[PDB]
Each structure stands twice: as structure tokens, then as C-alpha cells.
RNA sequence: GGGCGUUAAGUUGCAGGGUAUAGACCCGAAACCCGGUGAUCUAGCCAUGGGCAGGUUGAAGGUUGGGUAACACUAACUGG
């Protein structure tokens, strides 16, 4: 997984408030990260029909939690995705 | 006793009949062997030049959108 030194960084950048691991801004970023990284890893082997599942489980959550914004505070949704370019 | 012999005179020319050896009365093979001339036709190849009116179909690749976590994938336009 992402280095312990990593998550603690991204959070202080996306976390709705100074140092907080829970809000979508923080949730998403923390997820998209491991997703972008693993992408390369999977570009290798590509036979790990197990590790890939996790890739899905978390990715399936990305689009999932991302909806919470719409269903709730939409004002940030677009402001959050525009950050990682997600959705496209 | 028997077989072959012993009272046939030959031989050398010349003309001729026949034979042997040679092409052997004459004309005729299909082929065999030897040494040369031929790839200006044609078969293959080698180098170097040239030729193919018009009309048609429309692959791969690509750009865009859709699409997938990323690919797959998909539809147009292009491309040829
Ligand atoms: Mg007698």
C-alpha cells in the first residue's frame, strides 16, 4: 500500500480541514492515489486475478463515494474531481 | 589280315569358269563413334532501361466522440 509517509501528506492537501482522514476530498484522493500507482504494477504480471480484485473493490468505491457528493453537496463534487481529473 | 601308298607327269605363261581377301554387281536405311558450329527461334537465369486509358471496392493505421479504473470495445471521418 501507499507509504505511511504518503497518506499523511495527501490528507493535508485534500482533507476538508487541517489534518483529517474521513471526508470525500480526503477519501477520494487517498484512493485515486493507490489506484494510479497500482496501474503500473498491473501493467506487469497482469495474471494476479487476486490483487486486481482489490483494485476493483477500491475503484468501485471511487465512483461510489464520488456520487455521495452529487446526492449531497454537489458544489464540491466538480471541485474535487477537477483536482485529479477523474471522471473525465 | 586291314587302312593309306606303289605303272596319275608335271610345271610355267596366256584366255576363261569358280573361290578367298578386299566396297566385290548397283542404289537405300533407322542408327553407333569422333571433332567442330550453334541460346539472332526457344527454356532458365544475370545486368540495365521502359510499359500498364479509364472506372470500382475499400483492409491495416490514424483523429474525434461514446465508452472502460486502464485496456477491451464502439461509431463516424480519414486513410489508402
Ligand atoms: Mg591295298
- Say yes or no: Cβ of A88 under 7 A from any atom of strand B: yes
Q: How was this structure determined?
A: X-ray
Contact A87, A74 (CB under 8 A): no
DSSP class of A9: H
Rounded CA separation A36/A17 (Å): 24
- Say yes or no: Cβ of A35 under 7 A from any atom of strand B: yes
- Say yes or no: Cβ of A61 under 7 A from any atom of strand B: no
DSSP class of A73: -
| DSSP letters for A13-49 | HHSSSSS-S-SHHHHHHHHHHHHHHHHHHHTS----T
Q: What is the resolution of this structure in A?
A: 3.2
- Say yes or no: Cβ of A51 under 7 A from any atom of strand B: no
Rounded CA separation A86/A63 (Å): 9
SS3 A75: helix
Rounded CA separation A69/A87 (Å): 13
Å between A68 CA and B28 C1'?
121
Phi, psi at A78, each rounded to 5°? -60, -35
Amino acid at each position: 500500500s501507499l507509504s505511511t509517509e504518503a497518506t499523511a501528506k495527501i490528507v493535508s492537501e485534500f482533507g476538508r480541514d487541517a489534518n483529517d482522514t474521513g471526508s470525500t476530498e480526503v477519501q477520494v484522493a487517498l484512493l485515486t492515489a493507490q489506484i494510479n500507482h497500482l496501474q503500473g504494477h498491473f501493467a506487469e504480471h497482469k495474471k494476479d486475478h487476486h490483487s486486481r480484485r482489490g483494485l476493483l473493490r477500491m475503484v468501485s468505491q471511487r465512483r461510489k463515494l464520488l456520487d455521495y457528493l452529487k446526492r449531497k453537496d454537489v458544489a464540491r463534487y466538480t471541485r474535487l474531481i477537477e483536482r485529479l481529473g477523474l471522471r473525465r
